[PDB]
Amino acid sequence: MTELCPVYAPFFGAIGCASAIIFTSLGAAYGTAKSGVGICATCVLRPDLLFKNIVPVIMAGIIAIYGLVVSVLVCYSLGQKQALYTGFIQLGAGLSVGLSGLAAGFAIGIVGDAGVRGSSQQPRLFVGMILILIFAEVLGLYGLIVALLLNSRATQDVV
Amino acid sequence: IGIVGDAGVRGSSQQPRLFVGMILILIFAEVLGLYGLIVALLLNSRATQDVV
Amino acid sequence: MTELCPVYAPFFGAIGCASAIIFTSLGAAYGTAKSGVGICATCVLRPDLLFKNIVPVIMAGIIAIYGLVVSVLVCYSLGQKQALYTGFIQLGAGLSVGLSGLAAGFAIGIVGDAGVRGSSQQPRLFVGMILILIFAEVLGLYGLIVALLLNSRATQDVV
Amino acid sequence: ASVSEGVLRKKYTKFFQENIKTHLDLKQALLKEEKPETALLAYSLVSPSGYRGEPLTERKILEVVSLLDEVKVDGDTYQQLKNTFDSISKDPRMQVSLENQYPGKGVGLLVATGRELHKASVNGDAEAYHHQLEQISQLPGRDQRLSMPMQQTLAIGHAMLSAEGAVGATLGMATGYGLNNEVQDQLKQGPMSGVLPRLEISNVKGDFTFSMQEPAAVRALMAYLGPKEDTSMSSPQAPKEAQEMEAARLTLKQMLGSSPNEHLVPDVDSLLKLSDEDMPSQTESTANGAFKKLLSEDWDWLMPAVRAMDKGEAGKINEKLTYKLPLDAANGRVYLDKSPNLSDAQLDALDKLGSPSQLRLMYLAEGWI
Structure with a gap:
């Protein structure tokens, strides 16, 4: 409790549990808003292909589900009388998945906006757009992997 | 909800088929607040659980 | 908790693990967004250069794998009772690959959109684009080499 | 001036x-x-x-x-349509056409969302294919009486399937009726489609009646009008009941615009392909690939190519569909040109086909070639 496990350790497990869903929600909100200004501006002189253009909004929703996954696993390992090691690992995992989700959401929004705009002139660009949006989608998955590997070792061999 | 609601309103005059496509985008903006609300309610159930 | 192994020592390694994947994801996000605007504006006109023009997005996607292979090696050297020297080394290994990947991603994005807009007017510019993008790609590999040379010395002669 | 409509x-x-x-x-x-x-x-x-x-x-x-x-x-015109339809509802070839188009009468979240978005995009492209197909029959020489309500039914069904796929993907992603009814009544407004006769069927099973404003009956009608007439069913040597149904079938197939020796069999199957007798004539498959290349690269290259092809000008397609667009490159705007790069081996095959039959262009928009 002294030489390990202080009383301010769950602070770093609370902020790191809140940091994931906040910054993944900022990335998802930017991606949704930017893509949905591209939609409803390119689908106003063309009411068909409105419902096929909602691909980037699905991607931003997946970016939010990543941070919803990490914040539930960090919450169940919180508790009074835990180590500083566990709190630092939980903060690092939360910041990792949150800011990777923020970067991936900016990429999804900016690419999907231009792709949805320019796909109303060239129908072979849609298949191109998804092929770029997967490359922006795997950026969030890398931070999700780092968060899962950190949270796997937050309480292994911890006294 | 502010940014994509405004554009869908302004586009839904000259294209009446776009109102259904806006609500599918406003649902994805709505479920971000649900995810924050779920993590907030799931933390609050542990606030006085095994606290001495 | 000695003087050479305190309890706040995993803080530096934990935010060195997070800083590796954060700053390579921002570089890969800018290198994907800046390049993918110029691909979606050019394959409107030339829909059959699409798989030819995808190569700066692949080059930006390699940068995040550098940060991933730095973050998974720092994470396996974290411990509760580690030294401050190990935490300093893990900070250095995170920040080197992170900021080198950030600069490389800025360069790859800004070169790649101009290259795919210029290669579709002159087909003999696509080899010059790859030649400049290889020089922009190796700036992240230098930080990867430094991060792998630091991490090899984190627990050599450490008490 | 084949048909006119009103909506008041x-x-x-x-x-x-x-x-x-x-x-x-x-x-x-x-x-x-x-x-x-x-x-x-x-x-x-x-x-x-x-x-x-x-x-x-x-x-x-x-x-x-x-x-x-x-x-x-x-x-x-509608009297000839009432005499032509329901004189066609006697043969078993129409009966089996109304059976293939009718019934008897975690990571799994990613997989289900992929199915729903595929449904949305595939049923959304075909609506645009049919919207640029009702301006092809606006051209002189076509018809507007049998073609216009037939391909205004299919676009409505494809729009409904596209909205159903998008609503399904949204409802599945946000979790793992009133929205489908809101898109159903919305497509009921606008212009008014002309009527077609009802096609009642009375066989040994019972008295059935289909609608022809539903897309299943439309999709089952054009599969019947596909095949060419054989050595029987039109000769005056078995004149039993064929001069009232096969003459009606041929006058509908010609009213679309198809020659009596064109085959046009549907190709959507999981089985082996069209064997050799229903397989095309090697100047049709090349032409079909040219039409599919015209559809896949622009949203406005089918109607002017059909307009040029009816004039016999099907070698001038490469230089009449070209148009210039700007490109803001690193050295200023350059105004490049997009053009359909047809090869010569598919530019002379479009000379083999004189005029595109509307029945071929409707298998093209539905995906059966």
């Missing part, structure tokens, strides 16, 4: 004013005027199976479709 429901407002909610004495309130040779003909759309086991005896659509059939300007 206040001109013939007597038969839709009060609560006329019964097929009993619906023809008795239908005279109401000097209509003698033009009153019982409009009832003939709902006369066989509009009372004999009819739900509700009317609805909002089934009675509005009867008084939008104003035939007072001329009653010859």
Whole structure:
């Protein structure tokens, strides 16, 4: 409790549990808003292909589900009388998945906006757009992997 | 909800088929607040659980 | 908790693990967004250069794998009772690959959109684009080499 | 000038004013005027199976479709349609056409969302294919009576399937009726589609009746009009009942625009391919690939290419569809040109086909080639 496990350790497990869903929600909100200004501006002189253009909004929703996954696993390992090691690992995992989700959401929004705009002139660009949006989608998955590997070792061999 | 609601309103005059496509985008903006609300309610159930 | 192994020592390694994947994801996000605007504006006109023009997005996607292979090696050297020297080394290994990947991603994005807009007017510019993008790609590999040379010395002669 | 339509429901407002909610004495309130040779003909759309086991005896659509059939300007074209349809509903070849198009009568979240978004995009491209196919029959030389309501039915069904796929993907992603009804009534507005006859069927199973404003019956009708006539069924050496059904089949197939020696078999299957007798003639598959390359690269390259191809100008396609767009490059705007790069081996094959038959262009828009 002294030489390990202080009383301010769950602070770093609370902020790191809140940091994931906040910054993944900022990335998802930017991606949704930017893509949905591209939609409803390119689908106003063309009411068909409105419902096929909602691909980037699905991607931003997946970016939010990543941070919803990490914040539930960090919450169940919180508790009074835990180590500083566990709190630092939980903060690092939360910041990792949150800011990777923020970067991936900016990429999804900016690419999907231009792709949805320019796909109303060239129908072979849609298949191109998804092929770029997967490359922006795997950026969030890398931070999700780092968060899962950190949270796997937050309480292994911890006294 | 502010940014994509405004554009869908302004586009839904000259294209009446776009109102259904806006609500599918406003649902994805709505479920971000649900995810924050779920993590907030799931933390609050542990606030006085095994606290001495 | 000695003087050479305190309890706040995993803080530096934990935010060195997070800083590796954060700053390579921002570089890969800018290198994907800046390049993918110029691909979606050019394959409107030339829909059959699409798989030819995808190569700066692949080059930006390699940068995040550098940060991933730095973050998974720092994470396996974290411990509760580690030294401050190990935490300093893990900070250095995170920040080197992170900021080198950030600069490389800025360069790859800004070169790649101009290259795919210029290669579709002159087909003999696509080899010059790859030649400049290889020089922009190796700036992240230098930080990867430094991060792998630091991490090899984190627990050599450490008490 | 093959057909014209209207959408104002206040001109013939007597038969839709009060609560006329019964097929009993619906023809008795239908005279109401000097209509003698033009009153019982409009009832003939709902006369066989509009009372004999009819739900509700009317609805909002089934009675509005009867008084939008104003035939007072001329009653010859729809009379030939009433003689041609239901003379075709006798052979078993039409019966099996109405059986293949009818029934008997975690990571799994990513997989289900992928299925729904595939449904949305595939049923959304075909609606655009049909919207640029109802301006091909706007061209001179075509028809606007049998083609126009036939391909305004398929676009509505594809729009409904696209909205259903998007609503399904959204409802599945946000979790793992009132939205589908809001897109259903919205597509019921705008212009008004012309009527086609009803195609009642009376076989040994029972008295069936399909609608031809539903996409299943439309999709089952054009598969019947596909194959060419054989050595039988048209000769005057087995004249049993063939000069009333095969003549009707051929006049519909010609009314679309298809020659009597064109085959056009559907190709959607999981089985082995079209063997050799239903397989095309190597100057048709090349032409079909040229049409698919025209559809896949622009949203406005099928109608001007068909307009040029009807004039015999099908070698001038590469330099009449070219147009210039700007590109803001690193050295200023350059105004490059997009053009359909047809090869010569598919530019002369479009000379082999004189005029594209509308039946071929409707298998093209539905995906059966």
